[PDB]
Curated annotation (Swiss-Prot), chain A:
Localization: Mitochondrion
Subunit relationships: Component of the mitochondrial small ribosomal subunit (mt-SSU). Mature yeast 74S mitochondrial ribosomes consist of a small (37S) and a large (54S) subunit. The 37S small subunit contains a 15S ribosomal RNA (15S mt-rRNA) and 34 different proteins. The 54S large subunit contains a 21S rRNA (21S mt-rRNA) and 46 different proteins.
Additional remark text: Present with 2810 molecules/cell in log phase SD medium.
Signal peptide positions (record): none
Domain of life: Eukaryota
Natural source organism: Saccharomyces cerevisiae (strain ATCC 204508 / S288c)
UniProt family annotation: Belongs to the universal ribosomal protein uS17 family.
Protein name per the record: Small ribosomal subunit protein uS17m
Its biological purpose: Component of the mitochondrial ribosome (mitoribosome), a dedicated translation machinery responsible for the synthesis of mitochondrial genome-encoded proteins, including at least some of the essential transmembrane subunits of the mitochondrial respiratory chain. The mitoribosomes are attached to the mitochondrial inner membrane and translation products are cotranslationally integrated into the membrane. uS17m may have a meiosis-specific role as it accumulates during the middle stage of sporulation.
UniProtKB/Swiss-Prot annotation, chain E:
Family: Belongs to the mitochondrion-specific ribosomal protein mS26 family.
Extra facts: Present with 2010 molecules/cell in log phase SD medium.
Shown segment, full-protein numbering: 2 to 53 of 318
Protein known as: Small ribosomal subunit protein mS26
Compartment(s) of residence: Mitochondrion
Main function: Component of the mitochondrial ribosome (mitoribosome), a dedicated translation machinery responsible for the synthesis of mitochondrial genome-encoded proteins, including at least some of the essential transmembrane subunits of the mitochondrial respiratory chain. The mitoribosomes are attached to the mitochondrial inner membrane and translation products are cotranslationally integrated into the membrane.
Organism domain of life: Eukaryota
Complexes and interactors: Component of the mitochondrial small ribosomal subunit (mt-SSU). Mature yeast 74S mitochondrial ribosomes consist of a small (37S) and a large (54S) subunit. The 37S small subunit contains a 15S ribosomal RNA (15S mt-rRNA) and 34 different proteins. The 54S large subunit contains a 21S rRNA (21S mt-rRNA) and 46 different proteins.
Species this chain originates from: Saccharomyces cerevisiae (strain ATCC 204508 / S288c) (Baker's yeast)
Swiss-Prot record, chain F:
Localization, UniProt: Mitochondrion
Signal peptide as annotated in the record: none
Primary role: Component of the mitochondrial ribosome (mitoribosome), a dedicated translation machinery responsible for the synthesis of mitochondrial genome-encoded proteins, including at least some of the essential transmembrane subunits of the mitochondrial respiratory chain. The mitoribosomes are attached to the mitochondrial inner membrane and translation products are cotranslationally integrated into the membrane.
Subunit structure: Component of the mitochondrial small ribosomal subunit (mt-SSU). Mature yeast 74S mitochondrial ribosomes consist of a small (37S) and a large (54S) subunit. The 37S small subunit contains a 15S ribosomal RNA (15S mt-rRNA) and 34 different proteins. The 54S large subunit contains a 21S rRNA (21S mt-rRNA) and 46 different proteins.
Family: Belongs to the mitochondrion-specific ribosomal protein mS45 family.
Other known facts: Present with 3460 molecules/cell in log phase SD medium.
Protein name: Small ribosomal subunit protein mS45
From Swiss-Prot, chain G:
Main function: Component of the mitochondrial ribosome (mitoribosome), a dedicated translation machinery responsible for the synthesis of mitochondrial genome-encoded proteins, including at least some of the essential transmembrane subunits of the mitochondrial respiratory chain. The mitoribosomes are attached to the mitochondrial inner membrane and translation products are cotranslationally integrated into the membrane.
Complexes and interactors: Component of the mitochondrial small ribosomal subunit (mt-SSU). Mature yeast 74S mitochondrial ribosomes consist of a small (37S) and a large (54S) subunit. The 37S small subunit contains a 15S ribosomal RNA (15S mt-rRNA) and 34 different proteins. The 54S large subunit contains a 21S rRNA (21S mt-rRNA) and 46 different proteins. uS3m, uS4m and uS5m form the narrow entry site of the mRNA channel.
Cystine residue pairs: none
Species for this entry: Saccharomyces cerevisiae (strain ATCC 204508 / S288c) (Baker's yeast)
Miscellaneous notes: Present with 3270 molecules/cell in log phase SD medium.
Residues of the full protein shown: 62 to 122 of 486
Compartment list: Mitochondrion
Protein name: Small ribosomal subunit protein uS4m
Gene it is expressed from: NAM9
Family, per entry: Belongs to the universal ribosomal protein uS4 family.
RNA sequence: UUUUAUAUAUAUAUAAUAAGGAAAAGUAUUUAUAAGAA
């Protein structure tokens, strides 16, 4: 299906109809032998401007 | 019993000096292991000034004196892994399948051969002194090893329960 | 008190009613004593796991609820019943650790636990002699100090000693203990009997004969090995105890009431062992001689045949239907057996030990004579009663009447007895006996006693019999038929490697890699 | 459920064994209670009792938020033949690196393979696995086909 | 040689086996049921919410 | 019956088949018989 | 020697006295044809069997 | 411990009393495998 992620809005209103969403995933680091999280910031489309910083959203 | 059954193998043979005012005095240190190959082993040490033969002689008697029974699993290996620290040597020793060789450090090889430990795989970390390796080897063999029977009785359980389940 | 009586009647519903009643309506929860009684309940119903859970809770809840020496004695009894000696030893260590004070019962129960655990190499983990030795040591530690005694403990002590005597195959000690116990019981009862001795001789002997002592003596007989050496022989305290008891038995025999013990300190041959086994069994069956059932005459046979002819042919018409006529015959035979001979000493357990004596001693003739004289097959009895039903409603008839008469001497063949006879066939390598027994077991499956049991018990017993057949065909060397029995019932029975270890070994000796592979796949498909 | 509290408990039992104390205490939490019960059922601990910080409870006490702060679980330690039954106790899953194994890798661990640099099960050893907030022996966890986090190793 | 152990100790690749029917058939009801079942929206969701 | 292994029994059957054929054609020679009898007497004889 | 090293099987096979497990070090050679001839007493040497 | 008894002001100090005892025979595959020397 279409890729779906759960994230947290970080920047909103700096842009027009666009927000930044912090997305966290789980990955196994063999080198340190740890299931650690990795972060990335997605530029995401907000239409209707219904997004505010600190919202938990699905992208 | 003692001569016919026990086997002696020298482990360490060396010259140690004690430089006195007049000159360098040199004596002979010998460390030996005596084991019947059937679950009894001991270590001995000797120090002699005039000839190494006397050092090995006293070492043989001392090894005979400290001869002790050694726990053994199936009369071929250690009961479980032994991780032991002795005065700077780190011995990690693992029991092994029947037919597995003595894939260990040489000093441990003679000790196991004397004591009847057929099967073992181990590594020596930190310092690798043969003296300390041998001493720590015997100590970890006797202190750091517990028989399955003894463990079960201490836990008040039958051997059938404590024995591991087979998985594949 | 409620829980006490409920235990004595073994009423689970009454336990639930009383406990729930108190908790619901009275705010009363069981204390340490009531929880100990609950543990005794669970032990009575053979529910060991619940008893251990209750014991754990007694420790957990509070120090008032914390177990004391009485609960520890009960738990030691549970260990005995489960033949769990490591846990019994660990418990004894706990009583010492928690500073709880042992009593006489603690030592006696530990001795009994060790004696029972030493029965087989399998249950003893290969330390049987050591366990019997340790039980004796615990009895010595008892003998050292006064502790707290109980009126019953003395009896148990004797039993405990006999246990250690019985499982070690010490015939002479078992004989000495049996004689001393029976003599003291008889003299105590006769000295303290209100009525005249003669008239109440039946009641006196019925009180005197404790079936547990008989069973332990016959177990001592069955484990006879001439090359065996008693564990109690080695020690100085042990040899002194043996010497004292044997001297007392000897003196008592040298000095009314009589027992048929042969006039010898020890039995050195199998034949004498069989003779004494028959002697003591016959004495017990006769209530010590009060009942003269076992002795017979052709006069008695003919007269009893006539009497039961009259009785049965009269009762036949009266019954409404064949089922009711069976019920009447059942009631008659059952009550007849009890009046004939003591019920307690004559049962499945003592009979099992008695028939086990020759099997261990390796005499076929004595075993078959005993089996025929003291056993009857259910289906044969039912066929005989059907035959007599058709005979009366509408020498073989004399034979059937004599059969229903001789039922007073017999007990039905249960599954366990059939398995014992199968073991006899294995030991003696008699193919005819094996064929007879697995024919009779197949017939017995049809009779109502088998179908009365629960399906899991039926399947477990059938699995046991299949395993016994596999062992027989293995030892006879007919490997193909053993593999056939395993393969045919693979789904119905769970076959474990513990069952087929003998077969796997004996196949690997000849290197039948095909048969080994198929058998191992059956076992380990899992 | 803190692995920190469980680690503190493990070190406390080790220290209590080394100095040969018969009775000691641990925090009264369900993780600690399940841990103590699993150690006790396997014979490592002599007994479990309820209590307070001062000591074991004389009479039964209900557990409420009022007294929860001072509640403690008193474990009695076993010493047999001048040796400690609970000789050593370790945490396999550290709070940093937590080890959640599927059933196949638990079978591998029980069968002698080293998975995620975990030294496999030893004969006289005990390994505990938490699955869906229940602690249980690794063998039982495999028996119930339950995926879980491997927690600790008491030998 | 090590990686081959992952695939049954097989060195070399066959071309990936093709599918005669590229899409599920009508008679294969289960795929239709999953396809025409209610679409979940939430923490684990697949479509835009009602007002979004 | 004879305390032997199955593969040894099968090998015995095959070898006795070959022996039967050779005896039928008398392909065995006096030297071969002498060697057979010599070697047979150098080893212990199996008992059933 | 460099051929024996390749032929050498580090994993051996075994089916109260002690099993001599490590005498099977050279059991891999026993299936070679020339060794079979020598063991069958069909040759006075392995080279003669060759 | 618990239950009651006296006395004193539902409670307190004293005295007595305690229900937890059961017996039975027979019922392998163990797995992966890490050596140092000068």
């Amino acid at each position: 299906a279409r890729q779906n992620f759960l994230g947290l809005v970080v920047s909103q209103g700096k842009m027009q109809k666009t927000v930044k969403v912090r997305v966290e995933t789980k990955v196994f680091n063999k080198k340190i032998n740890k299931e650690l999280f990795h972060r990335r910031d997605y530029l995401v489309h907000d239409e209707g401007e219904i997004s505010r910083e600190g919202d938990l959203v699905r992208i | 019993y003692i001569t016919r059954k026990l086997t002696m193998k020298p482990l360490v043979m060396k010259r140690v000096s004690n430089q006195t005012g007049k000159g360098k005095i040199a004596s002979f240190y010998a460390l030996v292991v005596v084991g019947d190959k059937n679950g009894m082993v001991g270590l001995g040490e000797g120090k002699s000034r005039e000839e190494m033969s006397k050092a090995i002689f006293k070492a043989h008697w001392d090894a005979v004196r400290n001869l002790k029974e050694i726990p053994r699993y199936e009369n071929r290996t250690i009961y479980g892994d032994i991780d032991f620290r002795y005065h700077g040597v780190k011995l990690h020793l693992r029991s092994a399948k029947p037919g597995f060789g003595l894939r260990v450090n040489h000093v441990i090889f003679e000790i196991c051969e004397c004591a009847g430990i057929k099967d073992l795989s181990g590594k020596v970390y930190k310092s690798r002194n043969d003296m300390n390796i041998a001493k720590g080897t015997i100590e970890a063999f006797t202190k750091a090893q517990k028989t399955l029977d003894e463990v079960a009785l201490g836990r008040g359980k039958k051997l059938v329960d404590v024995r591991k389940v087979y998985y594949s | 008190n409620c829980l006490k009586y409920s235990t004595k009647c073994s009423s689970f519903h009454d336990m639930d009613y009383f406990i729930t009643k108190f908790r619901d309506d009275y705010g009363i929860t069981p204390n340490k004593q009531n929880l100990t009684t609950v543990i005794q309940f669970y032990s009575r119903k053979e529910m060991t796991k619940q008893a251990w859970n209750t014991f754990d809770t007694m420790k957990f809840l509070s120090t008032k609820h914390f177990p004391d020496i009485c609960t520890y004695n009960t738990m030691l009894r549970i260990c005995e019943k489960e033949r769990n000696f490591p846990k019994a030893l660990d418990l004894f260590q706990e009583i010492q650790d928690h500073n709880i004070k042992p009593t006489t019962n603690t030592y006696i129960m530990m001795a009994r636990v060790l004696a029972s655990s030493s029965s087989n190499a399998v249950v003893s983990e290969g330390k049987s002699d050591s366990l019997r030795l340790l039980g004796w040591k615990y009895l010595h530690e008892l003998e050292d100090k006064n502790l707290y005694r109980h009126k019953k403990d003395d009896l148990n002590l004797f039993l405990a000693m006999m246990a250690l005597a019985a499982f070690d195959g010490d015939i002479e000690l078992s004989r000495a203990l049996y004689y001393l116990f029976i003599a003291k019981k008889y003299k105590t009862l006769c000295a303290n009997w209100k009525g005249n001795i003669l008239v109440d001789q039946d009641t006196i002997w019925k009180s005197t004969l404790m079936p547990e002592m008989l069973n332990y003596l016959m177990l001592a007989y069955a484990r006879f090995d001439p090359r065996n050496l008693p564990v109690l022989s080695g020690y100085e305290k042990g040899i002194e105890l043996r010497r004292k008891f044997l001297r007392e038995f000897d003196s008592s025999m040298r000095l009314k009431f009589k027992l048929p013990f042969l006039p010898i300190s020890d039995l050195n041959s199998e034949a004498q062992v069989l003779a004494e086994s028959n002697a003591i069994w016959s004495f017990n069956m006769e209530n010590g001689g009060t009942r003269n059932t076992l002795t017979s005459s052709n006069e008695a046979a003919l007269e009893d045949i006539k009497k039961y002819r009259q009785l049965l042919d009269s009762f036949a018409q009266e019954a409404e239907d064949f089922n009711e006529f069976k019920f009447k015959v059942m009631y008659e035979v059952t009550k007849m057996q009890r009046e004939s001979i003591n019920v307690n000493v004559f049962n499945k357990i003592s009979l099992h030990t008695y028939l086990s004596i020759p099997i261990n001693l390796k005499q076929q003739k004595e075993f078959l004579r005993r089996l025929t004289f003291f056993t009857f097959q259910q289906h044969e009895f039912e066929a005989v009663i059907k035959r007599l039903y058709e005979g009366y409603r509408n020498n073989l008839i004399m034979h059937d009447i004599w059969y229903i008469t001789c039922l007073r001497h017999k007990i039905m063949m249960d599954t366990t007895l059939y398995e014992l006879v199968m073991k006899a066939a294995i030991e003696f390598q008699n193919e005819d006996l094996a064929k007879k027994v697995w024919n009779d077991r197949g017939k017995f499956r049809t009779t109502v006693p088998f179908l009365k049991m629960d399906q899991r018990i039926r399947i477990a017993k059938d699995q046991k019999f299949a395993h016994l057949m596999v062992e027989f065909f293995t030892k006879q060397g007919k490997y193909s038929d053993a593999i056939a029995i395993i393969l045919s019932s693979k789904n119905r029975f769970n076959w474990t490697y513990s069952m087929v270890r003998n077969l796997h070994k004996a196949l690997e000796e000849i290197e039948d890699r095909n048969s080994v592979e198929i058998l191992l796949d059956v076992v380990n498909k899992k | 459920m803190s692995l920190v509290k469980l680690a503190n408990t493990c070190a406390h039992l080790q220290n209590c064994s080394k100095v040969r104390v018969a009775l000691t205490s641990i925090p009264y939490t369900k993780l600690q209670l399940q841990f103590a019960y699993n150690l006790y059922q396997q014979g490592f601990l002599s007994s479990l009792q309820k209590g307070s910080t001062m000591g074991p409870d004389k009479d039964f006490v209900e557990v409420t938020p009022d007294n929860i702060s001072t509640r403690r679980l008193w474990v009695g330690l076993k010493y047999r033949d001048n040796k400690p039954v609970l000789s050593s106790c370790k945490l396999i899953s550290k709070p940093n690196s937590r080890i959640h194994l599927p059933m196949e890798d638990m079978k591998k661990l029980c069968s002698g393979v080293t998975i995620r640099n975990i030294k496999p099960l030893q004969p006289g050893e005990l390994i505990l696995v938490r699955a869906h907030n229940n602690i249980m022996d690794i063998n039982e966890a495999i028996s119930k086909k339950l995926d879980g986090e491997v927690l600790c190793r008491v030998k | 040689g090590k990686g081959a152990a992952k695939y049954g100790f097989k060195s070399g690749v066959f071309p990936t086996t093709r599918s005669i029917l590229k899409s599920p058939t009508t008679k294969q009801t289960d795929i239709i049921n999953k396809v025409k079942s209610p679409k979940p929206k939430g923490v684990l969701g697949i479509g835009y919410a009602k007002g979004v | 019956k004879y305390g032997l292994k199955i593969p040894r029994v099968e090998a015995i059957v095959k070898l006795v088949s070959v022996e039967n054929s050779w005896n039928r054609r008398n392909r065995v020679s006096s030297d071969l018989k002498t060697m057979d009898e010599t070697l047979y007497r150098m080893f212990p004889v199996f008992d059933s | 020697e460099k051929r024996w090293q390749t032929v050498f099987k580090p994993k051996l096979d075994s089916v109260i006295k002690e099993t001599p497990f490590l005498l099977q070090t050279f059991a891999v050679l026993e299936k070679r044809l020339d060794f079979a001839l020598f063991r069958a007493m069909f040759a006075s040497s392995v080279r003669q069997a060759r």
